[PDB]
Amino acid sequence: DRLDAALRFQQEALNLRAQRQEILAANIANADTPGYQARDIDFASELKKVMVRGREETGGVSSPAVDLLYRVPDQPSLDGNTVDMDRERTQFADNSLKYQMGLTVLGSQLKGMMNVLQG
Amino acid sequence: DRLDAALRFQQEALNLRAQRQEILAANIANADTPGYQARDIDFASELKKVMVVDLLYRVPDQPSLDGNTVDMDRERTQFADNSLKYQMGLTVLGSQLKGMMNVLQG
Amino acid sequence: SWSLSVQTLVFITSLTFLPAILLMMTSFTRIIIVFGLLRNALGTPSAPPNQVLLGLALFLTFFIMSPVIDKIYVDAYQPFSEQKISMQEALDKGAQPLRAFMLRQTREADLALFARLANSGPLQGPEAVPMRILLPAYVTSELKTAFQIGFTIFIPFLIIDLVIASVLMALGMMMVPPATIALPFKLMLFVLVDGWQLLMGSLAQSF
Amino acid sequence: QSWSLSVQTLVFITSLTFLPAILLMMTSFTRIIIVFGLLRNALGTPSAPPNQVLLGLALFLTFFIMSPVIDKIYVDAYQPFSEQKISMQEALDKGAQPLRAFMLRQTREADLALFARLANSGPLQGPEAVPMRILLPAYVTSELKTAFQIGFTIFIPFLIIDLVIASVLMALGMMMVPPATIALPFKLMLFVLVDGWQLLMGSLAQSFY
Amino acid sequence: QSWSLSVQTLVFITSLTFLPAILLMMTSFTRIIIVFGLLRNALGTPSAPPNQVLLGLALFLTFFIMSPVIDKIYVDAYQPFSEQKISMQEALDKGAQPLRAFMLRQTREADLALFARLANSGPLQGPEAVPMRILLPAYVTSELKTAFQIGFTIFIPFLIIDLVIASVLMALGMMMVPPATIALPFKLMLFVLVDGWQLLMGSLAQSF
Amino acid sequence: QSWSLSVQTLVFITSLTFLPAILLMMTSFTRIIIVFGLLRNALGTPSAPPNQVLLGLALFLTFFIMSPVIDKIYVDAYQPFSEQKISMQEALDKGAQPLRAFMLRQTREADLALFARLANSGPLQGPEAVPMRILLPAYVTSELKTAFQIGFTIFIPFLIIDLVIASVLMALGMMMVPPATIALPFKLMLFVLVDGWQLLMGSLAQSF
Amino acid sequence: SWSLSVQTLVFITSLTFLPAILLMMTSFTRIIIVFGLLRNALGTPSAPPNQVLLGLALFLTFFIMSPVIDKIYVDAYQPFSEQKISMQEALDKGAQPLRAFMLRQTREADLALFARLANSGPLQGPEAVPMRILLPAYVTSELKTAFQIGFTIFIPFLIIDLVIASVLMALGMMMVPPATIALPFKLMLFVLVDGWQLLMGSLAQSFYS
Amino acid sequence: VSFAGQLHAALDRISDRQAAARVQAEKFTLGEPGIALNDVMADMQKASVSMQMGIQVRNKLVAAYQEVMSMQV
Amino acid sequence: GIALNDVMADMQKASVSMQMGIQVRNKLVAAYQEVMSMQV
Amino acid sequence: SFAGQLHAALDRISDRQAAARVQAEKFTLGEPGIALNDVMADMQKASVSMQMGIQVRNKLVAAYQEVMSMQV
Amino acid sequence: TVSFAGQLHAALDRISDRQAAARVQAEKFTLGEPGIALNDVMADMQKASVSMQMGIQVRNKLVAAYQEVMSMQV
Amino acid sequence: TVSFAGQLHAALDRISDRQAAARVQAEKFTLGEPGIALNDVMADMQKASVSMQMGIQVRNKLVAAYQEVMSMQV
Amino acid sequence: TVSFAGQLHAALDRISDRQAAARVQAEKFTLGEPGIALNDVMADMQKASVSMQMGIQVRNKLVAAYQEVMSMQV
Amino acid sequence: MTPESVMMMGTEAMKVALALAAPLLLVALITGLIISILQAATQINEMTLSFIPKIVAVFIAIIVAGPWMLNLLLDYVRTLFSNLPYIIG
Amino acid sequence: VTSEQWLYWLHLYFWPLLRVLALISTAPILSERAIPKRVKLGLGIMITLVIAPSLPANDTPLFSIAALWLAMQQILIGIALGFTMQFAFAAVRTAGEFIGLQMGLSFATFVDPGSHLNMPVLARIMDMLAMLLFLTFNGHLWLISLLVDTFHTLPIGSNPVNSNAFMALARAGGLIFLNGLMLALPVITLLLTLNLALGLLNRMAPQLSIFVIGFPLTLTVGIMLMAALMPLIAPFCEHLFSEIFNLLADIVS
């Protein structure tokens, strides 16, 4: 209980990082599909929401209970998709580094605990 | 050895790709020899034979006057394809060896 | 509340002092010394094994601490789950029954000596005695109580030995050792009166 | 001039290993436990209180005895260390002086002279200039001698009881009666009525002063 | 010929590993420790001085006794090595000589002959050329013999005390009174009065 | 045919793990250490010389006893292998010979017969047909038996002294004294006046 | 069959449990318990050093388990090495001779108890017993057999001490320790009656009988 | 059904995935139609990831077993 | 299905809890054996 | 006294750990003004302090066990 | 009649002949002898490396098991 | 009269002095001082690390020797 | 007349000569002495490292074995 | 294996002990009784002169019957160790 | 997929392992130091592997004071079972030591109590005979079975506890003495008569008796008496084991 609660914030943040990267990869895959609005999630609000109330799924075809918001387009396009590649690749790299940061923090905490237990 | 049986297929494919690459480059080099026939091997049949070489003449497309049947475009495409497949075989064999290695490392 | 890893470190560290807690804080020393003196009384220093005496003292200690364990459970074990009190306010609250027990079993002279050994002048009240002054005083009081109980146990066996020797001397024997004759009579007296159960009952009554 | 943090941590953790050695050879502990080791022999019960009880009682008594020395070390040396006004080297130099004085006051002059002569040391102007290499073993020797003196003196009343009981047993013609078993309960009586434990600890504490 | 630095530090750490063996078999630690144990047994108090106290006393006495040898090693061998004047091999060879001389001073010729004859060594001219592999076991054996001699001699006054108290008790008819209980306090008194600890340590130091 | 250098390095560095096992089971260390422990028990004091001194002394004695075998191995195996004249496996086979002879010379016939019975061996023939896996346990058993034979007769003089002192003390009348307490100094006296250590080493060496 | 990477992984992992196989599935436990008990009996707790006894026990176990290892090699290791039997079937084929060796030396009472504790159905023949029942039954039977052997071993070495004490007591030497006298005589006995050949042969028969 | 059964199932699944990727790679190298290099390379990637997962699980499991066997009773 | 993120985190948590249990039991067993190795 | 100093040291170490954890948590949410290098340095400092506490505990426990094992 | 020493010798031989075969193939390919291919040289070298890693891991497991068995007290 | 405490103090002072010199040079180089080069800074830091590692190993060996000697039964 | 200390000294000296030779070769190459090739310099450096690591492993095994032999209860 | 076999094991063992110790104890007892009755007849009473001939008599007892004891005890131990693998359970 | 929920398996396999290992470390014959530690640990592990899947798994976290209470409960149950079993061997040792002390085997205890000179060799003889008998009657299997059975009576989950029950185990300390007296009785009494007979001899001409004639005679008589008395312990052995077992069954509940 105590150990589960202490490691729950970073674990949930890392899971939300994984889901956000899945969404960003879906946006990158559909970058040339005509009529596809780019989707993204508000990381902080959804993280607090998952924090207060546990993770839930729409079904389980299954998907998370996250709110898929639409990204504001930069410039218009005749085909009708709002996937701007610069934004997609910047968010992809930023999410990548933040996921690596979450892995580093969680691994440091778990070693910081094995150090105590080991004897 | 069991280690040979796992890596036999990719090694034989890599060697056959190298041999066919040499044959195609020989066809390119002898493009100007009058009376030279363009030779090639059937990769799949020879791979069966080695896993379980004979040179086959290429069917000419255009009739030249000096008897040379080497066509530039066909063999250039085949040469590029063989280079690509040799790289793919190297990649697959390296991946298998690296997996066998990380199984052991510890 | 401080860090979980520090809590784990402190808990495992405090687990080491378990023999110290059993000996210095509970009554285990008293029963173990009483058992040793009683064994010395019967004249057989290896009749019941040391292991058996230690385990019997452990069981007696567990029973005689059962009220204090219950008070600890009420004041510390339960509210630590309901989180009305936790960490600091509780560990000390749970240790309070131990303080009450050790105040009950400690003489005033030992506490006075250990206070004047620590220059603690303003120690006026009797429920605010620090652990540093309370612990060794309690141990010394336990030693005195155990020695007194051992002497009380010694009295009847000494009487039996003296009686046997006197009858041997009066009957004319001057060379026969009285210990060999008196040992089985000591045992038959100990068993017949059922010495063991009354001894444990008195120890439980002795608190 | 100050040591680096890594060197300071290394020195501190290394010196943490000498805790039993420091306790035995520098504090009161050696005089206490040894006397206990003899007292349990005088009472006629080698079992006595268990070994761990006696060891912990000696530890508590030692802490109470060295409370003034510990307080002086905390005030003069460790407090500037925590409040950053001193280095580790200077703290080590300064904190040992009260402990050196405590060791010197219980050190017999003969043993100190013996260890000087044995180290071929030059003329020591005054107590203040005595090296620690000379003060430590001399203090241990004087400590052992004092502990043996206290133990032999302790051995007296129980010898009185044993002699009286044996004389009474033999005067009645009861020659075949071993007096040790008879005299053991009376030794316990003597230790109980006079409050032997409290008196002995008070005597030890006063002896160190 | 000079060892490279990494080899030098490898040798240094490997030699530091063998420190207790050098202390026990090359210094005066073993004889003092044996005499202390025998003395503790002789007083009838098998556990009065804790083992750590006696071990520390023996270590300090050994350091004081071996201070001249350590000074000779420092002045002749270690100091030039620390100033890069000489290599590690020649420094070790030069440092062996004072310790070898000290060990030869405290060995018995019979044990040296026994180990020389056992090892089939050729005739050796004088004490100048005796291998360390020959000298070390002979020195250890001589130290054991000397320690036993000292302990047996020390055992005498306590034996006198035990015999006299036993005879005094027996001549009174006290047939079932054990003499150990009466003898132990008097053994302590005898050892205290003669200033036993410092006298025995001085005697051990003087014998070296 | 020869092993690759990587295989040679692997085998060589792996074989160093069995060095304590080789020293204990296959060499003279076991008998000497058992005799020393039994002598410590027989002296009346259980830990007078520290275990470290006895272990080092037994190691030196084992080296001195086995030096001829080591020389034979060096001549036959180590030297021609290091000069790259024989392979590793053949060098090991050649070097196993003098050690096999040393093990055989001290091996009881009954031990070898029993361990050949348990290994299904049928027509053995020449003493030069016993395999290493059969010879080794028989050698260990013979060494244990020989060490016990030496120890129980080392015990004899100290028992004589104990019995004589106890008989004299009790016949004189002082039956309340502990005979061992008075006897221990006399055991030390007997050990030092006979030169017990030197003679014991001589006997242990001449037992081979 | 498994991929070669999986086979190598399984082989390397299974190489870890070798001490467990030696201790809980092999003849090692009885021999080591008997050796420890015998060492406790002779009064020399450090005589054959633990390493010597361990090496002797290893050689004895190797000599005793030879037919089982031979059957495993001929039935499981040989077909597996010749690519006739898969890696996941060589283990099952080789676990049968070891199971048979463990069964013969086990005891009905232990088998019945551990068949009851698992709430398993009736086992009409030994061919229905799984490894989950045979393993601890074999372990308990081996422990009991080793302790029986050691406790009948212990008797003569205590008999000698008894007679030594009685003889010492006949003459009034009540303050002579009997253990110090008995130890050389116990060593003499264990030398005389081929102390080790008889014990070695008795243990080996105890397995093959 | 049991822990050993679950471990056997995991090993079988990992080996089956690796064999499927290898067979598809050999089919592509053979020249048979319909097999795309994209699928071959992605399946080899997935097989490598699964092998690494199995290796990590084995490493931990061995570490936990060593920890349990080190307990003093 | 369950991803590596969850599998690894629970795997580590179980390893940590098992190590904690082992250490606490070792402390308890050592204390008990120290108590029973007494001399009364 | 001594228990008080130990309690103060443990409190300081736990405050270190809590500050590092809170800073990392705030940085995870995307809060401005917290830089990655500061987070990593604080995490490493907290780890160093905790390791020092563990080592001190080990030395003290070993010293206590060695003292309590003496033969009076 | 199985032999653990014989089995270890056979395994060490297998590794050593694999390494020697790869080495000799590299020898001939460096010397310029026709018929030897570079990819075959590299593949044989990597196979020898895998075999030696096999041997090293088995050595580690065997040594650890032996040390744990011999560190036990009877 | 050579004392071991003096030698240990001298060795610790040498290690601390080397570490302090390397730290000071690195601090000055970070502050943009002209006459300090990066290669010298890194080499000095590595030398200080080597010296401190040597000190740690010597301390470990000394502690092992002391704990072995003080564990005797006299 | 075989002394193990003599063989240890010989092996240690041989390692030292290899290291010194590699160091001197690198020294001379740096000073631009004609006749020295970089590939041979690196090869001899790696051989020196291999020899030193072999010495380290042998020392580790010997020290471990000595500590296991020297800690038995006699 | 059966408890009857075990208790028989103890009995025969301790009867072997009795046979081993009976000659020495009986010789000592006879010597002590003879010296005591001689003291009573002569009206001499010192507790030490009865201790003198007892040692000599008991030590002669090993001279005369010692080989018999040594042969009996070895035979007992040999038979016990030989029958060890047949009383296993 | 690929779940392998580790916490469930750990909580299922931990507490039964704690109880089984707690019994193992204290139960006679299973707690003797001659067994290597790894053998005991493996036996506990295998017994838990057999038993645990049938039991209802607990879900209390290992990082809670509830886990500490559970561990204390398992340790208490195991040590109580093992110690109650050990009481019978304690009684046999007491009877043997008393027979030996009436032999005059160790006379130095009457003059120097606890003076490092005591050899209760008869106590050891009958202790190992009792161990052999316990092995024959398969008492250890019963112990293991009862360790398993105490679950149905007292499940792993924290349950409330009683009091005088502990006294019962402590009051079992009387049995060690009470049964010991009887075993002796069949021999000490006759020895007593023998000593009485020696007294009649000392009522004749003064001195010249005891310490010179009494000791060998009484030693030989004790030897042959209790050699004849050896067949008697086995029914008393079964009586002792039955007493301990049904006391355990009655009081553990």
Author numbering:
A (entry chain Q): 3 to 62, 78 to 136
B (entry chain U): 3 to 54, 83 to 136
C (entry chain F): 37 to 243
D (entry chain G): 36 to 244
E (entry chain H), F (entry chain I): 36 to 243
G (entry chain J): 37 to 245
H (entry chain P): 32 to 104
I (entry chain K): 65 to 104
The authors write:
The basal body is made up of the LP ring, MS ring, C ring, rod and export apparatus. Here, we present two high-resolution cryo-electron microscopy structures of the C ring-containing flagellar basal body–hook complex from Salmonella Typhimurium, which are in the default counterclockwise state and in a constitutively active CheY mutant-induced clockwise state, respectively.
To obtain the C ring-containing basal body–hook complex in the CW state, we constructed the constitutively active double mutant D13K/Y106W of CheY (hereafter referred to as CheY**), which can mimic CheY-P to tightly bind to the C ring and lock the rotational direction of the motor in the CW state. The density maps of the LP ring, MS ring, rod, hook, and export apparatus in the CW state were locally reconstructed to the higher resolutions ranging from 2.8 Å to 3.8 Å.
